[PDB]
């Protein structure tokens, strides 16, 4: 029970409820519906937002405190490839809410899949795909430098802005993104995120394939213990494959840092005409 600590932590990002106008439902999240909205800002402008709400039921003091912890966890993230907290509404209503920026094109996984259909985005070029990987690496570099562990890094948790920038986030199958040492023990480090980053790169390069076709979830641990890894996609440059492969080295200490991955990815992207 840390409700007093949490309210003091979130004080300077509290927002007046009446500045916010809610709109339609975007979907369901951990604690309830996610609405789109408009938020009138301090300087006088307007901003299209996503508003995370809590279910109408009497959700416990623990759920409320868990909800606000997540916001407090995000509060100081300031980076263009990391989702940012716009603020919170508490003290005017029975369930509080968290205000986030609107991500026009939604989650990256669904976007990759829609790009293979005529009606959605068009065919994504190789350079744009690489740029998505770069953005994610930039975001993860920032987070791992702050000692934040993601733990569920995947294309489905990455979000696309109006200008096609990727933001790392968590919405709140998954065995297939988990590093070998994290399956084997409870161990998570930044190097476990590196592994999940490699899988996300492979998702991006395959334009949204589920990792490890023909391997079922309950077979995964054994498959990885035998040293087997994701195969090279048919259209994937050898250099790009070498980069994703380095993310799955059995010893976490041998995997590259996010800085190194990001440098390697920028170099490959800039190497293309
Ligand atoms: C640490 C932390 C705490 C809390 C969060 C969080 O609350 N994120 C979060 C994310 C998405 C959410 O949903 C949507 C938001 C938008 C915006 N635009 N559009 C169109 C949307 C549609 C939906 C939607 C929901 N259902 N269906 C669709 C949502 F409600 C909450 C978070 O991400 N992190 C974090 C974790 C790891 C990092 F690297 C960085 C930050
Ligand atoms: Cl953002
Ligand atoms: Cl597919
Ligand atoms: Cl595979």
CSV table of C-alpha atoms and ligand atoms in Angstrom, one decimal:
chain,number,residue,atom,x,y,z
A,1,UNK,CA,0.0,0.0,0.0
A,2,UNK,CA,1.9,3.1,-1.4
A,3,UNK,CA,-1.1,5.3,-2.4
A,4,UNK,CA,0.3,8.4,-0.6
A,5,UNK,CA,3.8,7.9,-2.1
A,6,UNK,CA,2.3,7.4,-5.6
A,7,UNK,CA,0.1,10.6,-5.4
A,8,UNK,CA,3.2,12.7,-4.4
A,9,UNK,CA,5.3,11.1,-7.2
A,10,UNK,CA,2.6,12.0,-9.8
A,11,UNK,CA,1.7,15.5,-8.5
A,12,UNK,CA,3.4,17.7,-11.1
A,13,UNK,CA,1.9,15.7,-14.0
A,14,UNK,CA,-1.7,15.8,-12.7
A,15,UNK,CA,-4.2,17.3,-15.2
A,16,UNK,CA,-7.6,18.9,-14.6
A,17,UNK,CA,-10.3,16.4,-15.8
A,18,UNK,CA,-12.3,19.1,-17.6
A,19,UNK,CA,-9.3,19.9,-19.9
A,20,UNK,CA,-9.9,16.4,-21.3
A,21,UNK,CA,-12.7,15.4,-23.7
A,22,UNK,CA,-13.1,11.7,-24.3
A,23,UNK,CA,-14.1,10.2,-27.6
A,24,UNK,CA,-14.4,6.7,-29.1
A,25,UNK,CA,-13.1,3.4,-27.9
A,26,UNK,CA,-9.7,2.3,-29.4
A,27,UNK,CA,-9.6,-1.1,-27.6
A,28,UNK,CA,-9.1,-2.9,-24.3
A,29,UNK,CA,-6.0,-2.7,-22.1
A,30,UNK,CA,-4.8,-4.2,-18.9
A,31,UNK,CA,-7.2,-2.3,-16.6
A,32,UNK,CA,-10.1,-1.5,-19.0
A,33,UNK,CA,-11.0,0.4,-22.2
A,34,UNK,CA,-8.6,2.7,-24.0
A,35,UNK,CA,-10.4,5.8,-25.4
A,36,UNK,CA,-9.2,8.4,-27.9
A,37,UNK,CA,-9.6,12.0,-26.7
A,38,UNK,CA,-8.6,15.6,-27.0
A,39,UNK,CA,-6.6,17.5,-24.3
A,40,UNK,CA,-6.5,21.3,-24.1
A,41,UNK,CA,-2.9,22.2,-23.3
A,42,UNK,CA,-1.3,24.8,-20.9
A,43,UNK,CA,-0.2,27.1,-23.7
A,44,UNK,CA,-3.8,26.9,-25.2
A,45,UNK,CA,-3.3,24.3,-28.1
A,46,UNK,CA,-5.2,21.0,-28.6
A,47,UNK,CA,-3.7,17.5,-28.7
A,48,UNK,CA,-5.2,14.2,-29.8
A,49,UNK,CA,-4.5,11.6,-27.1
A,50,UNK,CA,-5.2,8.0,-26.0
A,51,UNK,CA,-6.7,7.7,-22.5
A,52,UNK,CA,-6.1,4.6,-20.5
A,53,UNK,CA,-9.0,4.0,-18.0
A,54,UNK,CA,-10.0,1.5,-15.3
A,55,UNK,CA,-13.1,-0.7,-15.5
A,56,UNK,CA,-16.3,0.5,-13.9
A,57,UNK,CA,-16.3,-2.4,-11.3
A,58,UNK,CA,-15.0,-1.8,-7.8
A,59,UNK,CA,-11.4,-2.6,-8.8
A,60,UNK,CA,-9.3,-2.9,-5.6
A,61,UNK,CA,-7.0,-0.4,-4.0
A,62,UNK,CA,-4.2,-2.8,-5.3
A,63,UNK,CA,-5.4,-2.5,-8.9
A,64,UNK,CA,-5.6,1.3,-8.5
A,65,UNK,CA,-2.1,1.4,-7.1
A,66,UNK,CA,-0.8,-1.0,-9.8
A,67,UNK,CA,-2.4,1.3,-12.4
A,68,UNK,CA,-0.7,4.4,-11.0
A,69,UNK,CA,2.7,2.6,-10.5
A,70,UNK,CA,2.9,2.0,-14.3
A,71,UNK,CA,2.3,5.7,-14.9
A,72,UNK,CA,4.9,6.7,-12.2
A,73,UNK,CA,7.3,4.2,-13.9
A,74,UNK,CA,6.8,6.0,-17.3
A,75,UNK,CA,6.9,9.5,-15.9
A,76,UNK,CA,10.5,10.6,-16.6
A,77,UNK,CA,10.8,8.8,-20.0
A,78,UNK,CA,11.7,11.5,-22.5
A,79,UNK,CA,12.8,10.1,-25.8
A,80,UNK,CA,11.3,10.2,-29.3
A,81,UNK,CA,11.3,6.4,-29.7
A,82,UNK,CA,9.8,5.8,-26.2
A,83,UNK,CA,6.1,6.4,-25.4
A,84,UNK,CA,5.6,9.4,-23.0
A,85,UNK,CA,3.2,10.1,-20.2
A,86,UNK,CA,1.2,13.2,-21.0
A,87,UNK,CA,-0.4,13.1,-17.5
A,88,UNK,CA,-2.9,11.6,-15.1
A,89,UNK,CA,-6.4,12.4,-13.9
A,90,UNK,CA,-6.8,11.6,-10.2
A,91,UNK,CA,-9.0,13.2,-7.4
A,92,UNK,CA,-12.1,14.1,-9.5
A,93,UNK,CA,-13.4,10.6,-10.3
A,94,UNK,CA,-13.7,7.0,-8.9
A,95,UNK,CA,-11.3,5.3,-11.3
A,96,UNK,CA,-8.2,7.4,-12.3
A,97,UNK,CA,-6.8,7.6,-15.9
A,98,UNK,CA,-3.5,7.9,-17.7
A,99,UNK,CA,-3.1,10.2,-20.8
A,100,UNK,CA,-0.8,9.1,-23.6
A,101,UNK,CA,0.0,10.4,-27.1
A,102,UNK,CA,-2.2,9.1,-30.0
A,103,UNK,CA,-0.3,6.7,-32.3
A,104,UNK,CA,-1.9,7.1,-35.6
A,105,UNK,CA,-0.9,3.8,-37.2
A,106,UNK,CA,-1.3,1.6,-34.1
A,107,UNK,CA,1.0,-1.3,-33.3
A,108,UNK,CA,3.8,-2.3,-35.6
A,109,UNK,CA,2.9,-6.0,-35.9
A,110,UNK,CA,-0.6,-5.4,-37.3
A,111,UNK,CA,0.9,-2.7,-39.6
A,112,UNK,CA,3.4,-5.1,-41.1
A,113,UNK,CA,0.6,-7.5,-41.8
A,114,UNK,CA,-1.7,-4.9,-43.3
A,115,UNK,CA,1.2,-3.8,-45.6
A,116,UNK,CA,0.9,-7.2,-47.4
A,117,UNK,CA,-2.8,-6.4,-48.2
A,118,UNK,CA,-3.9,-3.9,-50.9
A,119,UNK,CA,-6.1,-1.7,-48.8
A,120,UNK,CA,-3.8,-0.8,-45.9
A,121,UNK,CA,-0.3,0.6,-46.2
A,122,UNK,CA,1.6,-0.2,-49.3
A,123,UNK,CA,4.5,-2.5,-49.7
A,124,UNK,CA,7.1,-1.4,-47.0
A,125,UNK,CA,10.6,-0.9,-48.6
A,126,UNK,CA,13.7,-2.5,-47.1
A,127,UNK,CA,15.0,1.0,-46.0
A,128,UNK,CA,11.8,1.7,-44.0
A,129,UNK,CA,12.0,-1.7,-42.4
A,130,UNK,CA,15.6,-1.0,-41.3
A,131,UNK,CA,14.6,2.4,-40.1
A,132,UNK,CA,12.0,0.8,-37.8
A,133,UNK,CA,14.7,-1.5,-36.3
A,134,UNK,CA,17.0,1.6,-35.8
A,135,UNK,CA,14.1,3.5,-34.0
A,136,UNK,CA,13.5,0.6,-31.6
A,137,UNK,CA,17.2,0.3,-30.9
A,138,UNK,CA,17.4,4.0,-30.2
A,139,UNK,CA,14.5,3.7,-27.7
A,140,UNK,CA,16.0,0.6,-26.1
A,141,UNK,CA,19.5,2.3,-25.9
A,142,UNK,CA,17.8,5.1,-23.9
A,143,UNK,CA,15.9,2.8,-21.6
A,144,UNK,CA,18.7,0.3,-20.9
A,145,UNK,CA,21.0,3.3,-20.1
A,146,UNK,CA,18.3,4.2,-17.5
A,147,UNK,CA,18.3,0.6,-16.2
A,148,UNK,CA,14.8,0.0,-17.3
A,149,UNK,CA,14.0,-3.6,-18.3
A,150,UNK,CA,11.3,-4.1,-20.9
A,151,UNK,CA,10.7,-7.9,-20.5
A,152,UNK,CA,8.0,-8.0,-23.3
A,153,UNK,CA,9.8,-6.4,-26.3
A,154,UNK,CA,8.1,-7.4,-29.5
A,155,UNK,CA,6.6,-5.8,-32.7
A,156,UNK,CA,3.1,-5.9,-31.1
A,157,UNK,CA,4.4,-3.6,-28.3
A,158,UNK,CA,5.9,-1.0,-30.7
A,159,UNK,CA,3.8,1.7,-31.9
A,160,UNK,CA,3.8,3.8,-35.1
A,161,UNK,CA,3.4,7.6,-35.1
A,162,UNK,CA,1.8,9.7,-37.9
A,163,UNK,CA,5.3,10.4,-39.3
A,164,UNK,CA,6.2,6.6,-39.2
A,165,UNK,CA,8.5,6.9,-36.1
A,166,UNK,CA,8.4,3.8,-33.9
A,167,UNK,CA,7.9,4.2,-30.2
A,168,UNK,CA,8.6,1.5,-27.7
A,169,UNK,CA,5.8,0.8,-25.3
A,170,UNK,CA,4.0,-2.1,-23.5
A,171,UNK,CA,0.3,-2.8,-24.0
A,172,UNK,CA,0.2,-5.0,-20.8
A,173,UNK,CA,2.7,-16.8,-27.9
A,174,UNK,CA,5.2,-14.7,-25.6
A,175,UNK,CA,7.5,-17.7,-24.9
A,176,UNK,CA,8.9,-17.1,-28.3
A,177,UNK,CA,10.4,-13.7,-27.4
A,178,UNK,CA,12.0,-14.8,-24.1
A,179,UNK,CA,15.8,-15.2,-23.9
A,180,UNK,CA,17.2,-18.7,-23.1
A,181,UNK,CA,18.6,-17.7,-19.7
A,182,UNK,CA,15.2,-16.2,-18.8
A,183,UNK,CA,13.3,-19.4,-19.8
A,184,UNK,CA,15.9,-21.5,-17.9
A,185,UNK,CA,15.9,-19.3,-14.7
A,186,UNK,CA,14.0,-16.3,-13.5
A,187,UNK,CA,16.9,-14.1,-14.8
A,188,UNK,CA,16.3,-10.9,-16.8
A,189,UNK,CA,18.9,-8.3,-17.7
A,190,UNK,CA,19.3,-5.7,-20.6
A,191,UNK,CA,20.8,-8.7,-22.5
A,192,UNK,CA,17.5,-10.5,-22.3
A,193,UNK,CA,15.9,-7.4,-24.0
A,194,UNK,CA,18.7,-7.7,-26.6
A,195,UNK,CA,17.5,-11.2,-27.4
A,196,UNK,CA,13.8,-10.1,-27.7
A,197,UNK,CA,15.1,-7.2,-29.9
A,198,UNK,CA,16.6,-9.8,-32.3
A,199,UNK,CA,13.3,-11.6,-32.5
A,200,UNK,CA,11.5,-8.3,-33.1
A,201,UNK,CA,14.0,-7.5,-36.0
A,202,UNK,CA,13.1,-10.9,-37.5
A,203,UNK,CA,9.4,-10.1,-37.2
A,204,UNK,CA,10.0,-6.9,-39.0
A,205,UNK,CA,12.2,-8.5,-41.7
A,206,UNK,CA,9.5,-11.2,-42.3
A,207,UNK,CA,6.8,-8.6,-42.4
A,208,UNK,CA,5.0,-10.1,-39.4
A,209,UNK,CA,5.6,-13.9,-39.4
A,210,UNK,CA,5.2,-15.6,-36.1
A,211,UNK,CA,8.7,-16.6,-34.8
A,212,UNK,CA,9.8,-20.2,-35.4
A,213,UNK,CA,7.2,-21.6,-37.8
A,214,UNK,CA,6.8,-25.4,-37.2
A,215,UNK,CA,8.0,-25.1,-33.6
A,216,UNK,CA,5.2,-25.0,-31.0
A,217,UNK,CA,5.4,-23.0,-27.8
A,218,UNK,CA,5.9,-26.0,-25.5
A,219,UNK,CA,8.8,-27.2,-27.7
A,220,UNK,CA,10.7,-23.9,-27.5
A,221,UNK,CA,12.9,-24.3,-24.5
A,222,UNK,CA,14.2,-27.6,-25.7
A,223,UNK,CA,14.7,-26.2,-29.2
A,224,UNK,CA,16.8,-23.3,-27.9
A,225,UNK,CA,18.7,-25.6,-25.4
A,226,UNK,CA,19.8,-27.6,-28.5
A,227,UNK,CA,21.3,-24.4,-29.9
A,228,UNK,CA,18.7,-23.8,-32.6
A,229,UNK,CA,17.7,-20.3,-33.5
A,230,UNK,CA,15.4,-18.3,-35.9
A,231,UNK,CA,16.3,-19.0,-39.6
A,232,UNK,CA,17.3,-16.3,-42.1
A,233,UNK,CA,14.4,-14.8,-44.0
A,234,UNK,CA,14.6,-15.3,-47.7
A,235,UNK,CA,14.9,-11.6,-48.6
A,236,UNK,CA,17.2,-10.8,-45.7
A,237,UNK,CA,20.7,-9.4,-46.3
A,238,UNK,CA,23.4,-11.5,-44.7
A,239,UNK,CA,24.7,-8.6,-42.7
A,240,UNK,CA,21.3,-7.9,-41.2
A,241,UNK,CA,21.0,-11.6,-40.4
A,242,UNK,CA,24.4,-11.5,-38.7
A,243,UNK,CA,23.2,-8.7,-36.5
A,244,UNK,CA,20.0,-10.4,-35.4
A,245,UNK,CA,21.9,-13.6,-34.9
A,246,UNK,CA,24.3,-11.9,-32.4
A,247,UNK,CA,21.3,-11.1,-30.2
A,248,UNK,CA,20.7,-14.8,-29.5
A,249,UNK,CA,24.2,-15.9,-28.4
A,250,UNK,CA,23.8,-18.3,-25.6
A,251,UNK,CA,26.0,-16.3,-23.3
A,252,UNK,CA,24.3,-12.9,-22.5
A,253,UNK,CA,27.7,-11.4,-22.0
A,254,UNK,CA,28.5,-12.1,-25.7
A,255,UNK,CA,25.4,-10.3,-27.1
A,256,UNK,CA,26.0,-6.7,-28.2
A,257,UNK,CA,24.7,-3.7,-26.3
A,258,UNK,CA,21.9,-1.6,-27.7
A,259,UNK,CA,24.5,1.1,-28.6
A,260,UNK,CA,26.4,-1.4,-30.8
A,261,UNK,CA,23.2,-2.8,-32.4
A,262,UNK,CA,22.0,0.7,-33.2
A,263,UNK,CA,25.5,1.7,-34.7
A,264,UNK,CA,25.5,-1.5,-36.8
A,265,UNK,CA,22.0,-0.9,-38.0
A,266,UNK,CA,22.5,2.8,-38.9
A,267,UNK,CA,25.7,1.8,-40.8
A,268,UNK,CA,23.8,-0.9,-42.8
A,269,UNK,CA,20.9,1.5,-43.6
A,270,UNK,CA,23.3,4.2,-44.7
A,271,UNK,CA,25.2,1.7,-46.8
A,272,UNK,CA,22.2,1.3,-49.1
A,273,UNK,CA,21.7,3.5,-52.2
B,1,LIG,C1,6.5,1.5,-18.2
B,1,LIG,C2,5.2,1.6,-18.9
B,1,LIG,C3,4.1,1.8,-18.2
B,1,LIG,C4,2.8,1.9,-18.8
B,1,LIG,C5,2.8,1.8,-20.2
B,1,LIG,C6,1.4,1.9,-20.8
B,1,LIG,O1,0.4,2.2,-20.1
B,1,LIG,N1,1.3,1.8,-22.2
B,1,LIG,C7,0.2,1.7,-23.0
B,1,LIG,C8,0.4,1.4,-24.4
B,1,LIG,C9,-0.7,1.2,-25.2
B,1,LIG,C10,-2.0,1.5,-24.7
B,1,LIG,O2,-3.1,1.4,-25.6
B,1,LIG,C11,-3.2,2.1,-26.7
B,1,LIG,C12,-2.5,3.3,-26.8
B,1,LIG,C13,-2.6,4.1,-28.0
B,1,LIG,C14,-2.1,5.3,-28.5
B,1,LIG,N2,-2.5,5.6,-29.7
B,1,LIG,N3,-3.4,4.5,-30.0
B,1,LIG,C15,-4.0,4.5,-31.3
B,1,LIG,C16,-3.4,3.6,-29.0
B,1,LIG,C17,-4.1,2.4,-28.9
B,1,LIG,C18,-4.0,1.7,-27.7
B,1,LIG,C19,-4.7,0.4,-27.6
B,1,LIG,C20,-5.0,-0.3,-26.4
B,1,LIG,N4,-5.7,-1.4,-26.7
B,1,LIG,N5,-5.8,-1.5,-28.0
B,1,LIG,C21,-5.3,-0.4,-28.6
B,1,LIG,C22,-2.1,1.8,-23.4
B,1,LIG,F1,-3.4,2.0,-23.0
B,1,LIG,C23,-1.1,1.9,-22.5
B,1,LIG,C24,4.0,1.6,-21.0
B,1,LIG,O3,4.0,1.4,-22.2
B,1,LIG,N6,5.2,1.5,-20.3
B,1,LIG,C25,6.3,1.2,-21.0
B,1,LIG,C26,6.9,-0.1,-21.1
B,1,LIG,C27,8.0,-0.3,-21.9
B,1,LIG,C28,8.6,0.8,-22.5
B,1,LIG,F2,9.7,0.6,-23.3
B,1,LIG,C29,8.1,2.1,-22.5
B,1,LIG,C30,6.9,2.3,-21.7
B,2,LIG,CL1,5.4,9.6,-27.5
B,3,LIG,CL1,2.5,-14.3,-41.8
B,4,LIG,CL1,12.7,-20.1,-37.8
